[PDB]
Amino acid sequence: MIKKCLFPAAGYGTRFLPITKTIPKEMLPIVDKPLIQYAVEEAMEAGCEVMAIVTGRNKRSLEDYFDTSYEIEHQIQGTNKENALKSIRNIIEKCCFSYVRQKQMKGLGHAILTGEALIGNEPFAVILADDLCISHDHPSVLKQMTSLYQKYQCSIVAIEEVALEEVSKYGVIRGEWLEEGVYEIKDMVEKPNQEDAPSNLAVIGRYILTPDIFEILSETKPGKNNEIQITDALRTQAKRKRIIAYQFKGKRYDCGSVEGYIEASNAYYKKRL
Amino acid sequence: MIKKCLFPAAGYGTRFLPITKTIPKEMLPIVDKPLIQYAVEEAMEAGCEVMAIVTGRNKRSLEDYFDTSYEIEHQIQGTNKENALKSIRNIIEKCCFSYVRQKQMKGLGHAILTGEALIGNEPFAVILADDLCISHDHPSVLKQMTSLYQKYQCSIVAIEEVALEEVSKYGVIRGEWLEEGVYEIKDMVEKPNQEDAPSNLAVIGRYILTPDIFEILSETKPGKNNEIQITDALRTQAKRKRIIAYQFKGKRYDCGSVEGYIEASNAYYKKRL
Amino acid sequence: MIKKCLFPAAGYGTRFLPITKTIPKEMLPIVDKPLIQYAVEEAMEAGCEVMAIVTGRNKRSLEDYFDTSYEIEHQIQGTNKENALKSIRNIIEKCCFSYVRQKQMKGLGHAILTGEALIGNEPFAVILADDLCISHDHPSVLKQMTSLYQKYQCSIVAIEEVALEEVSKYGVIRGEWLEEGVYEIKDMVEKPNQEDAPSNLAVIGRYILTPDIFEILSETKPGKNNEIQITDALRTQAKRKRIIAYQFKGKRYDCGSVEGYIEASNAYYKKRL
Amino acid sequence: MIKKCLFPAAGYGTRFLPITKTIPKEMLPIVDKPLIQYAVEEAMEAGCEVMAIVTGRNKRSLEDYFDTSYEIEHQIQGTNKENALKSIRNIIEKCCFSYVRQKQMKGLGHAILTGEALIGNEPFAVILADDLCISHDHPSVLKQMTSLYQKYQCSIVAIEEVALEEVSKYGVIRGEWLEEGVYEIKDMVEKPNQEDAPSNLAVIGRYILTPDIFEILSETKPGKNNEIQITDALRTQAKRKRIIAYQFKGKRYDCGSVEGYIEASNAYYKKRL
């Protein structure tokens, strides 16, 4: 039962400067919940008990959010806003948190590698708080994955279809159909050109990796900005053995860009009715 | 010339829980800028050099934002994003921030008092970052106000005409027209009925108060749920002598409510053309 | 009453590195109280109501100390220990705290000028937490110095009779006698040597400056570094205005040195019985 | 070789309030460094590479200390003090730091349990910073134990010969002598009465445990006061197999008490001769 979930949060959020200079990206709110909370809730719902978070520059806000705020929950008690803290409070009492500082920030590659100090040798989950996913009366994307994992016992990378045009700015899969939405990764091509792309199935910020990935990342030569492309690592692993590519159910808003963030907040404002 | 501007950032932002239990209301971003940067930029543009900020227990975020650092600053200057830090950086090297910890929010009146310790004894501007104001080819709102002060030499409480029934949600003014958008305040009623509101000129979060307001504040008895309110203090100062009300040119979004918050976002995102 | 009290506290406290890399000097404990608490405790008993602290590098520890923390006031209430917090709990509820960060540290002179943002134009007390003073059935050194300001309403600075030896570690005075232990400063020489020191009365971390000092500090030109320092200013001030020296009652331990710091704690440990 | 060392640091530092309401106990300074530095320095000297620290609410300063500061690094450079950060620099450069947040301080048993998320299934050391150990030209205490472990391949709980009055507050051993100050534990008793105490052999804040302790701990019944403590878990191990009580070499100051704290202070001060 996947017990740990690794949240890479050392990113700089350059697209959101200047606020992202003091408030870590993962803390930007949707309507009033920080991005990171959706992410932890999703994971907790998938059965994870330990939330291993990789922090960067401003981690104070991150770590503090998951600390039990005694003051306001009492100074809000007996009022009509104790409902607002029910959820977060739940996570805090039911989850265990661990942290580790990302060395010289080198993307998602070293984030997972750095996080080995939090996971150790055991399969684990990985969530990108920036990929805000919601499931239309379906289990949270991660739960769909932990469940799938119980059957495949291997690394699972969540994929989704993008417009054949959009393909150039994604990590694309090329696998063997196996089941209703399951595939066997056979290769992965980072940001491929329209006529090279082996498919319209893009990789999303949701993984379930087997411990060996660590060792692999550790062997991956770094590219631009000595970033360790996970696609390289996964491709490496994929060529070694069977690993799944799963087409999750639900919607994903890319809160990576300012556009997605806005789109993301409106939808959720509308949700509230 | 007015040089200090009091920023009553001491509320709890309950309406924005849970995120607001770690990230202060004035720090919530619009697009990629905190509600407070907008306010401080307006203050500066109006001619202020000292930014007095009253705070509560969650100041760290608010104080860190305006402190000079270089770690997450000059760092990622390999990407075009080093222009995103131009404004804030300029604010930091051009303004002087000062803070005063308030023990427990007891209203804007109580806050204006605590702030005395930073303003001392001289006319000063007040801004509520929750009232995000923007002006179409017109000076900032506080500027219009400080400039009007050069002439009137008295407390200037900003107003805006609301709709016939939205009155019970603001502090309404009973005035006497003096000139284009300027009234002498004969009285001030807080959140009145429709059949009681002497006007539909509601008060916004933009003031310019003369030192005597401090003396008047401390003398103002409790009332509406324990709190001392600028409404009575203003009404007092108003009866003792001439204090003006100003119908500012420009638009203001009430981010005090998530609706205004969201709307403001879309509004400022849209404006990204 | 002298309302405000300045606390110059940014000096890198380089004599206490490496711990000073994260714990501000003023927060180093004597027995179980941070140094700064003795100072604020003094100022409070001297009638001071506003503790204006001039922070620097690490300071959330400084600002946080005087914030009323509930987590522990709750999780402790009912225990014998529910007393240790009675002193600071009192300082918190009775005093008011204002802050201002320093661009960077450059000595007492520049620190005080910085504090201008918290004083304006009123005489103000200055206390250097490093100089830990204790009175044997006497009012605090400040309370003593306040009585003098009542009488002469000019700057009052505490002096201490030292060993001719250490005359080189302090700024020494020279002034006509006024009352027993009270001198009108005629001149001040910076860290002179035994053979040609005007006296053995040294200046301690205890002042009461008249606002004009700020202008003098600004007018001041760097001398013993690229920094400006109080001795030169106090000279000028005593020459233009008038400033009285006071030979106080009680002991003072210099915690600017680790030796003095060690003695202090031993002293206060014995004193515990 | 033991790779990870657990550091319980959620302790409420009750005997050190009020400064402990803000400054974590593990961060109080001996001379010029926090209790925790000596701990990590000791674990590092015993070959440990990971420093798994269990923290409470006040832990920002603890995380920051082992964080590399590019600010004071510049200051230092060129300065006559460009060597006060050598000690901490070395540590930071040769150690990995992971942190786990403990919700409520319910003793050492719980603490170690919580740390399961950082250690994983492998033997590990444990060091209580409150117990400052220094060795008269001998390998660090925790090192004397990792070596001893290489041979005995089992849990090793460090012990010290103490005055009979001290017994009432430590876990005391009673074991079969095996070698040079090495014993097989036949039983352990928490804070025994001076007369029933099985020996003057007290247990110190030094452990090297084997993974099974984790399982034991979860099964272990909360003993004297809703708390679970290693004393029972270790006994349980003893019934099951051989575990050692090692009579280390070097001195141990119990900074758990202000009396020991003060003592430890004076010591290291003289030491700097």
UniProtKB/TrEMBL annotation, chains A, B, C, D:
Keywords, ordered alphabetically: Metal-binding, Nucleotidyltransferase, Transferase
Binding site for UDP-alpha-D-glucose: P8, A10, G11, K25, E26, Q102, G107, D131, G171, E190, K191, V203
Lineage of the species this protein comes from: Bacteria, Pseudomonadati, Campylobacterota, Epsilonproteobacteria, Campylobacterales
GO cellular component labels: cytosol
Source organism, top-level taxon: Bacteria
Catalytic activity, reaction form: alpha-D-glucose 1-phosphate + UTP + H(+) = UDP-alpha-D-glucose + diphosphate
Enzyme Commission number(s) from the entry: 2.7.7.9
CDD domains assigned: UGPase_prokaryotic
NCBIfam families named among the record's database cross-references: galU
Stated family: Belongs to the UDPGP type 2 family.
Listed name of the protein: UTP--glucose-1-phosphate uridylyltransferase
Binding sites annotated in the UniProt record for Mg(2+): D130
Molecular function (Gene Ontology), one example: UTP:glucose-1-phosphate uridylyltransferase activity
Function in brief: May play a role in stationary phase survival.
One record GO biological process: lipopolysaccharide core region biosynthetic process
Matches recorded under Pfam families: NTP_transferase
Residues of the Nucleotidyl transferase domain: 9-269
